[PDB]
Amino acid sequence: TPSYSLTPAEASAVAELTLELAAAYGSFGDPVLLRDLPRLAARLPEGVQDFLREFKLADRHGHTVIRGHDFDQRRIGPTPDHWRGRVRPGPEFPEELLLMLYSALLGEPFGWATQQDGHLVHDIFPIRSHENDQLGMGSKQLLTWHTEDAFHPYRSDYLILGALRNPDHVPTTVGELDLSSLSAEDIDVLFEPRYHIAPDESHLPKNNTIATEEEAARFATIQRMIDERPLGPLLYGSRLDPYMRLDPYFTSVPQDDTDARRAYDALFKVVDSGMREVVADQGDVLFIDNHRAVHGRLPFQARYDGTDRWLKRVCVTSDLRRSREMRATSATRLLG
């Protein structure tokens, strides 16, 4: 899997740029910053821009990493106890800006209106009260792998994860599809509309309000999918090198479809066995193609003392206007 290792000169240049922009703009609340993002991203080292452009256009490998960034630990400060109530932007604004620049080289940053106050860059660090069950703000318990929001027609196209700190080198898991491990028979079944993919609870329209025609319409397409339960494929794009959408937990293989069950079981085994540990250590930025890779998290014991692992996360869409029906305005980048 190709990666890019920054020279110390490149790391210094990236660091300087992010400090300059952090001083020049107030916050991501600034509409002008969001406008300026792709032009600003053109100020990144040329080798870096070339590398990500190649990754994007090759449409072959499902993840890549850019390693060796300089993330100033003294400036960044202690890992917070919670995301709620923090001053925004924080002293790690330069790192958030970096990830937004990278998102602009790949597409458009976007978010989910109900998640982390609508912030475009999410925090990933342990929160003591969240210690019980499977999520990003946890630690103690496993996070099995999946395509992000597999059921959703406007799911992320890419995900960008930047490791601000990771003292105990807790890796992330990512897995791709080795198509040669699957029979042509199984591939054809996986390309057919034979599977049901259920939404995560956070997407269910009965989660939110029932007032006004405007918001009802914002969830009408998802409601329709819940009501009609359309069957869909797990593989798509090119038969020779396919995209996938695989969330085992939310996937139903219809009981009577014996061929869909055989093929699904073969697909699951291939992806499960191909899972890899990718460490995103301090200064590493991991890029995940949500159409070619699944991702997961490993459990770890947190210290809750301001020294814990801290990642930042940005979701990327190749086509912001596609999701217009689920966005409250044309300008907003938040769905819901």
CA distance linking residue 115 with residue 160, whole number of Å: 16
Q: Degrees (nearest 5) of the Cα angle 301, 307, 313?
A: 80
> What does 135 bind: a second copy, Fe ion, none (CB cut-off 5 to 8 Å by kind)?
none
Q: Is 148 one of the annotated binding-site residues? A: yes
96: contact with Fe ion by CB under 5 A = no
34: contact with a second copy by CB under 8 A = yes
- Judge contact between 174 and 295, C-beta under 8 A: yes
Question: What's the min distance (Å) between Cβ of 32 and a second copy?
Answer: 9
Q: Which two tokens stand for residue 67?
A: 């390693």
Backbone angles phi, psi at 242, to 5 degrees: -85, 150
Chosen residue from 9, 87, 210, 331 binding a second copy by CB under 8 A: 331
Q: Degrees (nearest 5) of the Cα angle 307, 312, 316?
A: 170
229: contact with a second copy by CB under 8 A = no
123: contact with Fe ion by CB under 5 A = no
148: contact with Fe ion by CB under 5 A = yes
Q: Which two tokens stand for residue 241?
A: 């090198």
Which parts of 286-305 interact with a second copy (CB under 8 A)?
291
Rounded to 10°, the helix 8-24/46-58 angle is 90
10: contact with Fe ion by CB under 5 A = no
- String marking each residue 90-119 x if it binds a second copy according to CB under 8 A: ---------------x--------------
Q: Is 313 one of the annotated binding-site residues? A: yes
74: contact with a second copy by CB under 8 A = no
Chosen residue from 49, 116, 181, 208 binding a second copy by CB under 8 A: 49
Sign of the CA dihedral with 21 first, then 165, 119, and 287 last: positive
CA distance linking residue 336 with residue 327, whole number of Å: 6
CA distance linking residue 192 with residue 280, whole number of Å: 36
Which residue is it, tokens 């870096």? 48
Q: Which two tokens stand for residue 170?
A: 């807790």
183: contact with a second copy by CB under 8 A = no
Q: Could you list the residues that contact a second copy (CB under 8 A)?
A: 34-36, 38-39, 42, 46, 49-50, 53-54, 57-60, 105, 157, 213-214, 217, 236-241, 243, 291, 318-322, 324-325, 327, 330-331
Show binding-site residues.
146, 148-149, 172, 203, 295, 297, 309, 313
